[PDB]
Design a protein around this nucleic acid. Structure first.
Lengths: 59, 96, 114, 206, 127, 79, 98
RNA sequence: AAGAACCUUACCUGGUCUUGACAUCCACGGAAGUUUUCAGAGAUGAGAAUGUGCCUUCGGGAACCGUGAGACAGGUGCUGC
RNA sequence: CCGGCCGGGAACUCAAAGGAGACUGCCAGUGAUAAACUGGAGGAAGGUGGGGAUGACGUCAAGUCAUCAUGGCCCUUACGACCAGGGCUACACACGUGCUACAAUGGCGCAUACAAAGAGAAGCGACCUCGCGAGAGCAAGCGGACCUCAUAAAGUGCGUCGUAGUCCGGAUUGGAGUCUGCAACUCGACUCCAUGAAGUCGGAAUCGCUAGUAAUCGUGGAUCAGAAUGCCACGGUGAAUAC
């Protein structure tokens, strides 16, 4: 299994997705929400999006 | 005007949010007993401005204590001025 | 059922005379109501000694009657003897529980005196 | 004392909003103060460039600022060096990557901000208020607006008693919301006091 | 057609499955007599329920949604009117003459600045 | 009426009260903080509450335990 | 299954953006559920006009946040390639779920 | 006043002023900061421990901190006639 | 699972975009052959449909130099500035606003209903357990038509109170949970158990309101660590009278 270990704070950039050539800093991760909370810049717009390792493929 | 209060409010913001809000919160949950007291004494020996009680949430362009609105972030007069000039997006007069 | 007071049940409820006797509250009244579990609006003829004894032991277990005058008397008296103002301001008779007396608190102050 | 701001009463109807972005309740005030610091800086920095309107659009990653100006050359500077220094300082005020566009204001005498700052500059230079107002209304009525109201107010000509003198030409229909009236003020900081100038210009019914 | 619940009054909308049968009103699979059958003012809300005079042979199951009780009654009544015009249009004129096809647009006037209520002003001191 | 997680005492007053008890030879203790519940260690001492420029000295007794320090002290004056 | 919540302060910007996303899904040729409207959040602010004294004369403001959710049945790789700055309107905030 | 327990918050006691709580320079030294002891009602001091990282065409530049004289501040002080 | 819960459907409530409709448009009468007025048909709405925003030239030298900016004047080893504490919360009396009422068209006790608007990330907090209770601990769902705040309150069906100072609620120091721990003494509220005053519908006078209004019944907001009967919105039943 490629990247079977999951590390919090690990940065992955998706070239196929709209996230390419975008840089951000993850100050807060909501463990109580049980979904990863990063203010992701998508379509040139930075909004907090809930995410999961099964939800988005790791680069 | 009222620069003393500006720097006092900056003082209690930096003393509450930055130096503390972790030490104070841990001492608060140590103070509530879960099964003279050390947490009460140490929360006294912390400075008083660290408490989020202290901050009067005040206007950004002027410094009026009152008519502050948290969402816009300014005094009542200043949000009227920016609303009537168009600075605030989506702010239209209500007439229902 | 007269215990340490001046009031008596008379073809009515025990609880109104009980709360008329000072030194208590009405949680004793509600507790005697829950202990009896019967309609107390009925006649007081054949007043039960079980009611008398439960009334007595409830009063004795909780704050006994006559203690309101006791508390106010020691409060005013000990601060008057020690010279402090807490009992003096109870002697003056205006509200110090936090209440406004500027034009209100006529229940303490009585009729208005010009 | 009793009249509505025309832009505020026409904000959703005719006139467009000056700043266009969406921030939530946690970031709205922080963006608004960022816009004010950018706008205040660029106004006090290019008041000599005669800027009329500044629109700030945030796509929540970057900032795009458009400066509506009569004279684009002094806003640009040479080779865009002035506007690139402006772009850098707007980037560090906003804290996010920046971008400046220059949209030009043709017919500067029909823009109320430009007329208000023109009368303000003359009143600082001790030209008389009556000549300033007659010049403004005559130039607008020549240039092709349907009407113009110029209000000057307070400490006119160095009198101790302040007065409000209004000069009006054409149609200025304030109560009609379908009309477009651009209304803008300016503040002249004279020696005896402060003289405030209010101009309304009526261009048409939308 | 199946005669159904139509129309609004105050803050209500009618969901009545009115159908031929003996009219006994059931609400949320439960009886009028269990809910408020012997309630006073049930009769004077049920009289606009009847006032369309096509209730004499119609069984009523009433689960009108939203709003207060008299408004719910008006919604039910307006629904029987609109459904009966959907059935046949000769009796439109008689419901118009009686005045039941009219929706009553009366609604709560809003609170207002410097005032306790919609019209109610502070008590004014002459001095 | 107040918290049961701990009876509040001012820390400077706690230090000076235990020092006064340990020494046994003390003057009035001057305290500006009036908001302290009296411990049973305080009995046998005069502890001075702050009223005005003037002095209010309180000899705290066995009864005055649950009460705060400023109840016995008047801040305002009247006829 | 792609769940896109796009929100703005102006309904014309909202309709332009949701028509653009519907156009993108129509260009890739998938079954598109209609853009549903979610209820507008009329946040009302009642703010004093007079600097010194008034209570009766005061003006009220509203921010109106509009909301539509498109809820397209089928996403695809061509749309994922074509998402890059597809919205391009500063007034609208777009929220994405899988 | 769309929030008087402190704060807010100006009126009564202690502490401080040529840089003041608050910006600009000119001069010198130190990273910024973190963790503590003691006195005291406390911004006040008097002490301790770790961090000289960020860099300059190093003839050393930083957001910064401490101090010194000047300019300078500052004022919810008066006049809305 | 007899909960739309589950397939389905989009038929309706709805949610929210665009249209239509209401213009004296038609008819009759009056009126000058005009404006208009008065009725009638159609119609959900009828003649500004209701409400709101909108406040003309000016007036009071009305208010704000305490929001800010600003001219002149003044303090500047203080009229700047920090901390502790205190006052803004006191009280012989008088009016201005609102609340609780003087009960029986009402309480009190069991059961059973029907809304709308809003807020929420240091934020909203279910379910379970422990408590008479305020609440505590465990704690899902949530940056929102989901989840939470939040099984509204009058309306009730049966009973009981049938002068009762009534659950109408006043009154110091307690017995308490909770907020921030500078800290509930001067100083928050909450079932507070604290003795159940007064007022048995109110003199001269006075105030608010022509239809969903008055009156009554409950709910949410903003300020905000907490602290409303004030302010800012929302719903229910529903008047009487204009000669």
């Amino acid at each position: 299994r490629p990247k079977t270990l999951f590390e919090p704070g690990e940065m992955v950039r998706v070239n196929d997705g709209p996230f390419a050539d975008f840089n951000g800093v993850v100050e807060e991760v909501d463990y109580e929400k049980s979904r990863l909370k990063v203010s992701v810049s998508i379509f040139g717009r930075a909004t907090p999006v809930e995410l999961d390792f099964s939800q988005v493929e790791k680069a | 005007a009222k620069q003393s209060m500006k720097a006092r409010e900056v003082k209690r913001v930096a003393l509450a949010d930055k130096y503390f809000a972790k030490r104070a919160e841990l001492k608060a949950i140590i103070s509530d007993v879960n099964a003279r007291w050390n947490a009460v004494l140490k929360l006294q020996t912390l400075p008083r401005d660290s408490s989020p009680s202290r901050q009067r949430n005040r206007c950004r362009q002027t410094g009026r204590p009152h008519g502050f609105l948290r969402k816009f972030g300014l005094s009542r007069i200043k949000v009227r001025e920016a609303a009537m000039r168009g600075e605030i997006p989506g702010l239209k007069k209500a007439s229902w | 059922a007269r215990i340490a007071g001046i009031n008596i049940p008379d073809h009515k409820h025990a609880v109104i005379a009980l709360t008329s006797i000072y030194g208590v509250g009405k949680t004793r009244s509600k507790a005697i109501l829950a202990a009896a579990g019967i309609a107390e609006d009925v006649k007081i003829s054949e007043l039960s000694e079980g009611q008398i004894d439960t009334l007595r032991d409830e009063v004795a277990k909780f704050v006994v009657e006559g203690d309101l005058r006791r508390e106010i008397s020691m409060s005013i008296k000990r601060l008057m003897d020690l010279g402090c103002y807490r009992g003096l301001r109870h002697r003056r008779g205006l509200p110090v529980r936090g209440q406004r007396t500027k034009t209100n608190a006529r229940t303490r102050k009585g009729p208005r005196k010009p | 004392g009793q009249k509505v701001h025309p832009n505020g009463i026409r904000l959703g109807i005719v006139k467009p909003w000056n700043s266009t972005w969406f921030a939530n309740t946690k970031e709205f005030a922080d963006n608004l103060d960022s816009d004010f610091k950018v706008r205040q800086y660029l106004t006090k920095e290019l008041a000599k460039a005669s800027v009329s309107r500044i629109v700030i659009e945030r796509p929540a990653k970057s900032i795009r600022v458009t400066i509506h100006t009569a004279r684009p050359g002094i806003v640009i500077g040479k080779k865009g060096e002035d506007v690139e220094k402006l772009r850098k300082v707007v980037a560090d005020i906003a804290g996010v990557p920046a971008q400046i566009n220059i949209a030009e204001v043709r017919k500067p005498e029909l823009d109320a901000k430009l007329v208000a700052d023109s009368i303000t500059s003359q009143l600082e230079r001790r030209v008389m208020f009556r000549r300033a107002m007659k010049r403004a209304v005559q130039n607008a009525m020549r240039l092709g607006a349907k009407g113009i109201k110029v209000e000057v107010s307070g400490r006119l000509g160095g009198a101790e008693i302040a007065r409000t003198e209004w000069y009006r030409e054409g149609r200025v229909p304030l109560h009609t919301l379908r009309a477009d009236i651009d209304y803008n003020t300016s503040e002249a900081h004279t020696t005896y006091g402060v003289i405030g100038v209010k101009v309304w210009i009526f261009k048409g019914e939308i | 057609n199946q005669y159904y619940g139509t129309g609004r009054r105050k803050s209500s909308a009618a969901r009545v499955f009115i159908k031929p049968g003996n009219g006994k009103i059931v609400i949320n699979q439960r009886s009028l007599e269990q809910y408020f059958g012997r309630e006073t003012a049930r009769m004077v809300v049920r009289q606009p329920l009847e006032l369309v005079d096509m209730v004499e042979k119609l069984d009523l199951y009433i689960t009108v949604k939203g709003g207060g009780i008299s408004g719910q009654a008006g919604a039910i009544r307006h629904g029987i009117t609109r459904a009966l015009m959907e059935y046949d249009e000769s009796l439109r004129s008689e419901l118009r003459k009686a005045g039941f096809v009219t929706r009553d647009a009366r609604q709560v006037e809003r609170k207002k600045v410097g005032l306790r209520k919609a019209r109610r002003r502070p008590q004014f001191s002459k001095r | 009426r107040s918290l049961k997680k701990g009876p509040f005492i001012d820390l400077h007053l706690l230090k000076k009260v235990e020092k006064a008890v340990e020494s046994g030879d003390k003057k009035p203790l001057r305290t500006w903080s009036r908001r302290s519940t009296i411990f049973p260690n305080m009995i046998g001492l005069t502890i001075a509450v702050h009223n005005g420029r003037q002095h209010v000295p309180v000899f705290v007794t066995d009864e005055m335990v649950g009460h705060k320090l400023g109840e016995f002290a008047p801040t305002r004056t009247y006829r | 299954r792609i769940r896109i919540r796009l929100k703005a302060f102006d309904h014309r910007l909202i309709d332009q953006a949701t028509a653009e996303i519907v156009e993108t899904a129509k260009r890739t040729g998938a079954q598109v559920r209609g853009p549903i409207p979610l209820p507008t959040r009329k946040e009302r602010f009642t703010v004093l006009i007079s600097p010194h004294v008034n209570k009766d004369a005061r003006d009220q403001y509203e921010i109106r946040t509009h909301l539509r959710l498109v809820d397209i049945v089928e996403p695809t790789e061509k749309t994922v390639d074509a998402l890059m700055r597809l919205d391009l309107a500063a007034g609208v905030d777009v929220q994405i779920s899988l």
